[PDB]
Amino acid sequence: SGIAVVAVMCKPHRCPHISFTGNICVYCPGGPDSDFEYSTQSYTGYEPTSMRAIRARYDPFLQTRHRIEQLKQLGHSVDKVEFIVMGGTFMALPEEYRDYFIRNLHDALSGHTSNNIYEAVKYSERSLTKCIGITIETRPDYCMKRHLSDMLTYGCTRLEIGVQSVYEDVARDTNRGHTVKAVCESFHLAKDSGFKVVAHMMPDLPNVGLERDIEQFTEFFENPAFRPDGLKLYPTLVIRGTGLYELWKSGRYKSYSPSDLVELVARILALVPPWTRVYRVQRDIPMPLVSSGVEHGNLRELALARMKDLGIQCRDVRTREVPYQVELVRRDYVANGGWETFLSYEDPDQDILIGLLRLRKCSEETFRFELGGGVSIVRELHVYGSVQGFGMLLMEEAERIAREEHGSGKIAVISGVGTRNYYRKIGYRLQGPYMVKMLK
Amino acid sequence: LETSHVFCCPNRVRGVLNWSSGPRGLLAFGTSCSVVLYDPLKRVVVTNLNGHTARVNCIQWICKQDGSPSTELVSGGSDNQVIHWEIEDNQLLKAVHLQGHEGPVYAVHAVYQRRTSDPALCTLIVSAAADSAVRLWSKKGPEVMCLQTLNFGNGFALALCLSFLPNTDVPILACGNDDCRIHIFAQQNDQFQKVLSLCGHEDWIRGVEWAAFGRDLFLASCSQDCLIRIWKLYVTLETVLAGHENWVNAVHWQPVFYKDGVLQQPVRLLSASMDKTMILWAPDEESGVWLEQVRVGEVGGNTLGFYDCQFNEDGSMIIAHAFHGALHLWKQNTVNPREWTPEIVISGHFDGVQDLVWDPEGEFIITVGTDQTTRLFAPWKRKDQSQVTWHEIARPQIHGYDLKCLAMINRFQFVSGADEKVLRVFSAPRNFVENFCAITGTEPPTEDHLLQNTLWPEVQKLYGHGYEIFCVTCNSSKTLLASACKAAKKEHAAIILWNTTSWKQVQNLVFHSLTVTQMAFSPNEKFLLAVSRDRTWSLWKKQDVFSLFAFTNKITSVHSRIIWSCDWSPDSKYFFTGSRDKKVVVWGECDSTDDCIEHNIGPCSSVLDVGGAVTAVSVCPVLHPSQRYVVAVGLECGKICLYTWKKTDQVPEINDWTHCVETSQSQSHTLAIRKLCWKNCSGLHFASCGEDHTVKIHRVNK
Amino acid sequence: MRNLKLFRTLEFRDIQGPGNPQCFSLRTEQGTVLIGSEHGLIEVDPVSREVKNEVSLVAEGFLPEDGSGRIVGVQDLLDQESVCVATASGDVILCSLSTQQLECVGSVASGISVMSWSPDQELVLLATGQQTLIMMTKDFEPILEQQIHQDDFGESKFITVGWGESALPWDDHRPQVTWRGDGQFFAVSVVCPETGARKVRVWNREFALQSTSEPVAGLGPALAWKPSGSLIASTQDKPNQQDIVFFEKNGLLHGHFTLPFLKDEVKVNDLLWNADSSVLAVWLEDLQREESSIPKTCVQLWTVGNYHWYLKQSLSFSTCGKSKIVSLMWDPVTPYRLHVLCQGWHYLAYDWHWTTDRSVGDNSSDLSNVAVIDGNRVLVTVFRQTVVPPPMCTYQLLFPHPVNQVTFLAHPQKSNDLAVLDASNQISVYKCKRYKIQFENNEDQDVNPLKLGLLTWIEEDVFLAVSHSEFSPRSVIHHLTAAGQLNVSSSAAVDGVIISLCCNSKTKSVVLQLADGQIFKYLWESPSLAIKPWKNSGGFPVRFPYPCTQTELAMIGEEECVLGLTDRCRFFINDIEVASNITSFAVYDEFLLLTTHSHTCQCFCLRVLRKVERGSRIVTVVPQDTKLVLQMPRGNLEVVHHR
Ligand SMILES: C[C@H]1O[C@@H](n2cnc3c(N)ncnc32)[C@H](O)[C@@H]1O
Ligand code: MET
Ligand code: SF4
């Protein structure tokens, strides 16, 4: 009936920028050097995924099986699953461990026992339990061409690049390790690659005022450089064992007032564009561990209540998602030097959403060999409603406007594994990791 | 040079365990890149069938028509090759290689042909690979060739079985598939027309098996849909079903055995499932409706397993192969037919072993593996038989990290390292001491008791190294430790000395600029040698607390590349170094007690050239007259050699070194060697381990 | 997506009085300019149609006494009915109107370089010659006197953990002050004697030093705080290019853009913001090439779209001295209106409004083109085929000179062409996918920059222009046509100023709009070229209560009718005022489309309610496929099918 999310976590490992610098980022809690035993990174080891992974001693196969069994027990069916690999910078381990991990995931899902990743994916394509996709997180300094190629090979279809704030002084003063220009370049390469980028933000960094935060978010949703596809809000928490904890203890940093924080969240939600999704607004770190930060977990509800009080309303994807009189609405804009399109079906008066799609013309910076002739791309298709079927309409219209407006000759789609068969049924062939159709 | 004992465990694949049917029978499970022959009568393996380059996946005996024990067998691995093995008496005569089948081979089957004109053991082989292909191989004498092939396009073959039509000699083939459509048909050029394709199951069919026919060909079908269906062939087909939850992956009928001159063919089945369950379906007396006989397995526990189950001769026992490389043998109670008991079998690490060390007294050996486990092996005295067998006694800890270095201080006190920053110390409890004294002077434990009830406590936790520990060592007096960390800068890579009685740092020698591979004290206990990845070595001397006495810059080093291992001499007069440059160099200084000469350190002897990279050099501890030294070298390919060195008069490069016995094909590791530990002497035996998941004990005498 | 357009050029010249005017201010609430010269203060009202003369002139020539004695600041006191005046000698006085009496209120022992006032007119700042800025209360009560060359950073320091060219020679040493829109902070620029380059400091309203500028090289002597938001503009002359940069409250550089000139050719004089933080005015001066004696003195207007600074309009002035600009300012009450005072006692007033340059046509061969101006380039989007987001275009045209005005021909069946006027008073024609340059015609008579009014293309060979007279403001209609374009005819100077020159492609009907509100139907093909009051149903009384920013001619029912929209959200239909909430509208083939500010989109047809986001402005409609293209403030477009 619906896809089930399966969360797995990796083994502990130090972040890469510790060598040429002195330390890791000044606020990230946990880690192998921290005081939490088996703290992978950015994780104390108390969230359900944390000890769920610890019980399997960070084994891919065992974690997958345990989560599948738990979900199957409570009525939920497991025909379709989505993997989430958490646990800090994954693309810094030696290649062998990464290959091991992903191949074990695929074989656990399928049942076949594979040697390399290619055999694992070839067999998992034929499985009865289909995998929609995989999502990984990565620092901007590890999202160059080779890393993107590797992510394409693994079948991952969604990045989680975290750029904390647009200001460069903030980055240089927190020992993040890179620059904002690198973040913009990484977004450019990812968008022209054909992924679905979702960014991380932290709206309470030191030396940042409330006015600065409002301005930076307005720029973030206005500057054509960033314009991300999905956003997560992580208000800063002062956890013991980090440099930020030392700063706060030294009486040189204070947290935002709870009412101020709620109001700021309200404005940020009200400013969100329609085509941008808000995955999360809070962090699941256990309460009695943080010395100073958010009030309680009731953060989304207070934000919505205050927004309703002040007359503002949020029009993001999650709130507007769920016969009724539906109609086709089209939106276009620019991001990272690319012409983005947002074909969708919706019902205006009741402001509900049914089906959506994401197109994009390919820029001149594309490097993947499958994209070298003015190829378009379909970054994402998603339908959760019911009536020919809406998906046929969306694909037909998208191909039409690719042939006519974009002036392209070839169209490509990114997919998981069962989606490969779904798109092949409508007349596509497979080339590399992409699903291609010759558009006249 | 005889191999006394070998420890290993099977691979983690479906169908890796097979057993010949006959008066004796033989198990032929596969380790990393070799096949192991192991008698099950609580005895030891007999031979090792090396030859595969990659992992080994499928093993099957060739069924014998007249009830004789099997003679030949087939193994298909991940090396794109299929090997036919023939043995007369544990001897490995004339293995045969078969090529083709790009991609890993995941299914093989073998049948003796019923040729009437040519009784020259005409054999048929079917092979299904990961390239969605299945191919044939007919063998007569030494003649091997392929035959008609069959593509599946995108579909894949999962389970293969082959048999004959009940009256006419017709070779029938039943192939599992990934589309719930097991295909049964003929294969040869004269008969390859598909006749029928069953569709009973509702999931991937992981098992199909042609049964012993009373009068009609019975057939088993086993899929992931938690159902087992029995199909009867006569050219007509029938269908019967059964019931048992979760994935089911192993079905086999009872074979025929000669009961006092008369062959017998009972009716029985055997099912192994992921839910830690194994069933013994049997037809009913009244209406022939199959009902269970007994539930056996670790129901409700963790570590879901049982990839395979196989059925002993004449139903005497049942063997099963589990997820974590551990077997499970169950035996029938003759007094009570409705009762079975677990039995004692072989075990071993399921991932590459890294290090080991002899008992100071010389009774047991402890291994650590990249499978994140520590295990102990000791012999069993029993009561009467002169034959002595070794077994896995205890499992001190199941750690959550990999293990790389190990050292021994007291007879029950050892220090372990890992891919982390801390060092750990362990002590034997009091229950283990008594259980061991009962074993050496009750019986070796089974699997579950080892897994759950056997562990060791932690006593200490050494801090303050900085990075991942890479090496450990101890002095002769067992009073000063030494360790090094994996490092990439001169500052980090430093030697740390501890005090055993207090577990505190004592001194912090620092001279190397990169990782230190291995260190070694000296029997004189007045020196300490350390080689590094910097293609150099250092020597430190205790003063009457350690200072530098020797030195080696870049130019004054015969070795060109990373030096891997180093060793001392029993007289504490010379020492040896083995590098990755395929060269071993002995350095002589003759400096002991008081030597007022400054430095004067030189090689003093020649240089050799072994066939490959050197990763372990050892010197036998005992000395014999003529002042003739002996060295054991563990190469990289997997072989071990013994050489003898004698000091020349004036020219080092004249017959400096003499050759000795080499390891043969059967007694040689497959991937790489990691240690060569001689048994303690003066109040011959030595042990070798490597990345083959195997541990070997050898013996030699002059 | 949208462009500025000129519709009023009020001008008064030949002002008489003292010599060499220096600074001036503005009075609202039925007030006019208040130029103050070396002798005294002069009040002049040029607004009146027939009256442009001094009113209540006063003199104070006995304070400076024939010396230089330049006035460093003039400021109206709002309703207090007084004008504060500060002299370079160091005296601050409070004059009065209709009484011609003086009132010395403050004396400083050192020269008062700059005098500035708070936006709310409550606090006033003095930049003494002692390098000690001073605060006076509204009634000249001393508050505080702080040094300007203090060295410590201030208050808003940065909490940090341990983990990890002199000034421009052509810059006179002179402090500059500004304020923020809400009057909560202010900024001071000054050269650093310790360093030798400019260095900005920011103060709170109560003299709480907040932050100091980072050491940027090549800083210029410019300072301007954007009213809303938080931006402060300056110049960063680099070794290769000339750029305009922005700071923020903490004092850090953040974003910039490039002036399209040579490496060493010009210099910046001042930077001004419009009334609503939407238009930036830059004043430049030619640094070198004295052969033409500074031939160039250009003022340019820049706006921002999707973080792209466009170049909308350019104005040129000679630096002879007779016509040389000495001051300029934005109207603090209404946007898009600026006032300029020259050296030769000349006063100019410029007014603009905001519009889109559509391309109406019949049902076929239309393509619904849209054009946008950007520097010396034109971005054209064909909305019939490709719906391009704003920063890109269907295609792009390049010109050697900056562009000032574009127009689409109204001939039916050929509405696929465009005429462009450059800053050099030259006209380029592009005619029918791509286009080839047809003609580059040159005008015959042009004496003053930006003298041609609304430029309309009626027939494939004719153009209509409006020129405004100086004395007794009268509008003259010029007919431009030739094979070099000759001003063939000039219609009678009508009584007043014409604002709108809307035309209908059908019936070839031309409509004229006067400022007061009368509507006149002029015949471009008339043998007499006479004008006629617009024909209503009877009596013909049609007069808009207020001037309309947009005027359109639509045939409703059977006859024609006039529709108007003003800037106060009022919709007029032949003086009916149907409703007052509209924001924008369009008419195409008997279809009336309009927003409502109550979040709806009416779709009345000529012979229904959908929902929209905040602040959606209608851009274009395609009756084919019945698709209309809304635009949101953030930049994205949105195509919707009403039916
Ligand atoms: C997983 C996410 O957690 C964020 N993160 C790092 N440190 C903290 C903290 N102290 N509080 C909240 N979020 C934090 C990282 O910035 C990353 O984006
Ligand atoms: C868990 S922190 C967020 C993911 C990654 N370490 C990054 O900073 O980009
Ligand atoms: S890079 Fe990310 S995971 Fe690593 S320390 Fe910094 S915030 Fe934490």
Residue numbers in the entry:
A (entry chain C): 85 to 406, 417 to 481, 495 to 547
B (entry chain B): 6 to 239, 273 to 479, 543 to 645, 654 to 792, 805 to 823
C (entry chain A): 1 to 164, 186 to 453, 484 to 534, 543 to 666, 687 to 722
From the article:
The Elongator complex is responsible for introducing 5-carboxymethyl at wobble uridine bases (cm5U34) in eukaryotic tRNAs. The highly conserved complex is composed of two copies of each of its six individual protein subunits, Elp1-Elp6, which form two discrete subcomplexes known as Elp123 and Elp456. The modification reaction requires S-adenosylmethionine (SAM) and acetyl-CoA as cofactors. tRNA binding to Elp123 triggers SAM cleavage and acetyl-CoA hydrolysis that provide the required reactive groups for cm5U34 formation. In this study, we present a series of cryo-EM structures of human ELP123 in complex with tRNA and cofactors at four different stages of the reaction.
In addition, we prepared samples of ELP123 without tRNA and solved its structure at 3.58 Å resolution. The reconstructed map only resolves the WD40 domains of ELP1 as well as ELP2 and ELP3. Notably, the acetyl-CoA loop is not visible in the tRNA-free ELP123 structure, suggesting that it is highly mobile and does not block the acetyl-CoA pocket the way the analogous loop does in bacterial DmcElp3. Here, we show that the analogous loop does not block the acetyl-CoA binding site in human ELP3. We present the initial state (ELP123–SAM), substrate-bound state (ELP123–tRNA–acetyl-CoA/ECA), and the post-modification reaction (ELP123–tRNA–DCA), which enable us to propose a sequential order of action. First, the initial state of ELP123 exhibits high structural mobility when it probes for potential tRNA substrates. We observed the presence of an iron-sulfur cluster in all obtained structures, coordinated by three highly conserved cysteines (Cys99, Cys109, and Cys112). 5ʹ-dA and methionine are the products of the reductive SAM cleavage reaction triggered by tRNA binding. Together, our structural analyses suggest that in human ELP123–SAM cleavage proceeds constitutively in the rSAM domain and independent of acetyl-CoA hydrolysis by the KAT domain.
